[PDB]
């Protein structure tokens, strides 16, 4: 028939083909050329120290057993052909759980050119590990990696390369940014050798540089803490004799600053060190407690009844020391 010509080409290609053996198993090294098209950089989970990334992982390699001569130079075939030829066993070193999509058909590609050059594209959703150091939180930047390489074939068997220049071999789409908390500054690739128990392997690294935005935490943490400190210092402008009024400033500011301290350190996972936000909370929590101690000292010295020199000193000393702390802290951590 009209389509039997390609049928006999495929049946001649697969006749006597051993897919258990890589091309040049005993003669040379199977070089595999790789590039990544990031269709969407998904959300970064702070709690699990991971990130999600959607790709068009492409691999290309030379196989001399898939040479053909026909009327068509490139055989654009489906996914069923890729299970009958040798394909490299590329896995992600720092992945946790990634899905190769197969709706509605398996999201794969296979194009066999006439010189034997192959191309094998896949749709993946990699949940890789991003080890984080939350010491400058929330004003911190990250270098979340994506390391991939072969699983069974060592450095002497299968090597990996980038098919274009390394600056252009990982492309992120323009609409593809599902980051809401961070922003993507750029990509960074590298190639190296990893040593393991079984042998030495070629590993290819892609570093995605992230930077957190503080907009949320300057509305759900920093500004309520500043307003709690300010409202704890408006109790210095009152009457000395109003004991329950200044008492209820002291207790309500201490309780709400405690509640803010609980509903802040809880956002992220449980780390042993202290973030910059915890230092801001601790200094604020010291300021409000000092205001309470100031009222307690004034009330131990009340008995007409003159205003207090402690109140007149604390009307000036407390806000200027809070401003000095803010101008130190923000200039230290933003720079």
């Amino acid at each position, epitope marked *: 028939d009209n389509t039997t010509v390609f049928t006999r080409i495929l049946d001649r290609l697969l006749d006597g083909y051993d897919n258990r053996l890589r091309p040049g198993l005993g003669e040379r090294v199977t070089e595999v050329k790789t590039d990544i098209f990031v269709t969407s950089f998904g959300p970064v989970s702070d709690h699990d120290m991971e990130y999600t990334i959607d790709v068009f992982f492409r691999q290309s390699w030379k196989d001399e057993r898939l040479k053909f001569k026909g009327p068509m130079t490139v055989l654009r075939l489906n996914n069923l052909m890729a299970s009958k030829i040798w394909t490299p066993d590329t896995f992600f070193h720092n992945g946790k759980k990634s899905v190769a999509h197969n709706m509605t058909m398996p999201n794969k590609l296979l194009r066999i050119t006439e*010189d034997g*050059t192959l191309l094998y594209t896949m749709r993946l959703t990699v949940r890789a590990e991003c080890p984080m150091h939350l010491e400058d939180f929330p004003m911190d930047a990250h270098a979340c990696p994506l390391k991939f390489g072969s699983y069974a074939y060592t450095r002497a068997e299968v090597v990996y390369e980038w098919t274009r*220049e*390394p600056a252009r071999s990982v492309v992120v789409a323009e609409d593809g940014s599902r980051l809401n908390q961070y922003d993507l500054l750029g990509q*960074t*690739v590298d190639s190296g050798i990893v040593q393991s128990s079984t042998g030495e392997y070629v590993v290819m690294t892609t570093h995605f540089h992230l930077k957190r935005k503080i907009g949320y935490f300057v509305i759900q943490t920093y500004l309520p803490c500043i307003m709690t400190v300010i409202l704890s210092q408006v109790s210095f402008w009152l009457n000395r004799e109003s004991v329950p009024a200044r008492t209820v400033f002291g207790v309500t500011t201490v309780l709400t600053m405690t509640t803010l301290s609980i509903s802040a350190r809880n956002s992220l996972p449980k780390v042993a060190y202290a973030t910059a936000m915890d230092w801001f909370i601790a200094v604020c929590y010291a300021f409000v407690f000092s205001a309470l101690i100031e009222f307690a000292t004034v009330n131990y010295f009340t008995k007409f009844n003159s205003v207090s020199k402690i109140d007149r000193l604390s009307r000036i000393a407390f806000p200027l020391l809070f401003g000095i702390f803010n101008l130190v802290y923000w200039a230290t951590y933003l720079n």
Partner: antibody, heavy 116, light 105 residues
Framework: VQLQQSGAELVKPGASVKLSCTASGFNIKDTYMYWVKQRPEQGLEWIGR????????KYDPKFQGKATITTDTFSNTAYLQLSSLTSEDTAVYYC???????????WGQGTSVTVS | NIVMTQSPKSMSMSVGERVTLSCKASEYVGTYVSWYQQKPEQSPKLLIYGASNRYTGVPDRFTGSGSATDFTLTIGSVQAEDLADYHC????????FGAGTKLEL
């Protein structure tokens, strides 16, 4: 395993010169072909890139327009087209094969052009 | 573009001691430098690819090193036949080259 280039050229300024180098022992469809400029008593300067399997070319922005790179499949040969030759174009040209981990593996013997 | 700023221009020492080079990058090039020698009236030959990889035909006295931005090439007991010019390049992006480090007696 051997990249043989053309001979030395001496033409008047403002003309055009055809320059070429032939790769033997392999095929140029696998690896990229790089062109480089070496001024005397100076450092190397990159001219352009060509992918013979794809036909894509990429050039130095300071060398855009005045130089372009072509190729053919049957002769396994990389070609240069130089236009509007001046006094600063007196240099020796090598064609470099892309190698392991993007390294400029093989090099030609060198073609020196001179204007007058 | 990426700018290679290898230093110095030339070093004039004897035969049989340790001499090192340096190559500093303007932007990131990650283990993608390449070192070549340049004899007078001779084409460049490859010595080191990647960051520290010894090419075939290179003696064990030529040891390279690399990092994210700072690169170096250390020579152990340089001989009389190694008196040539050394070049540092990059290929993480479209390739650029440095000026060149020479050797003298």
């Amino acid at each position: 395993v051997q990249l043989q280039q053309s001979g030395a050229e001496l033409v008047k300024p403002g003309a055009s010169v055809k320059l070429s180098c032939t790769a033997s022992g392999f095929n140029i469809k696998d690896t990229y072909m790089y062109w480089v400029k070496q001024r005397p008593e100076q450092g190397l300067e990159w001219i352009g890139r060509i992918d013979p399997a794809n036909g894509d070319t990429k050039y130095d922005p300071k060398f855009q327009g005045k130089a372009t790179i072509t190729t053919d499949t049957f002769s396994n040969t990389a070609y240069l087209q130089l236009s509007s030759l001046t006094s600063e174009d007196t240099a020796v040209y090598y064609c470099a094969r892309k190698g392991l981990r993007w390294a400029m593996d093989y090099w030609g013997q060198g073609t020196s052009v001179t204007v007058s | 573009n990426i700018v290679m700023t290898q230093s110095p221009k030339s070093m004039s020492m004897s035969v049989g001691e340790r001499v090192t080079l340096s190559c500093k990058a303007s932007e990131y090039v990650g283990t993608y430098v390449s070192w070549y020698q340049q004899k007078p009236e001779q084409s460049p030959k490859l010595l080191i690819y990647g960051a520290s990889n010894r090419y075939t035909g290179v003696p064990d006295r030529f040891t390279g090193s690399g990092s994210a931005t700072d690169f170096t090439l250390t020579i152990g007991s340089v001989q009389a036949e190694d008196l040539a010019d050394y070049h540092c390049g990059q290929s993480y992006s479209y390739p650029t080259f440095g000026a060149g480090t020479k050797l003298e007696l």
